[PDB]
Design a protein around this ligand. Sequence first.
Ligand code: CA
Length: 92
Amino acid sequence: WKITDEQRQYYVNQFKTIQPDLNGFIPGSAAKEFFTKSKLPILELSHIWELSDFDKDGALTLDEFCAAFHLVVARKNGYDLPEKLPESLMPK
Ligand SMILES: [Ca+2]
């Protein structure tokens, strides 16, 4: 795993429309749609959100965003990812 500052800007350049800085929160609805817009079906988008939404507040912060976009990119051009998020048995 790794991230390039050059890339982080790429997302913000556009996402800035909704997520300007690490002081922003995107509702799962926006993420679902925004990401869905890319290609991956909402079905998959679920996994991305859960993984990117370490807090599970139904809101994605610039960070959740950064990881989400990056992770999504990989899901599209990388390797198969795991699945720690249990269907109905979250470690809580
Ligand atoms: Ca969150």
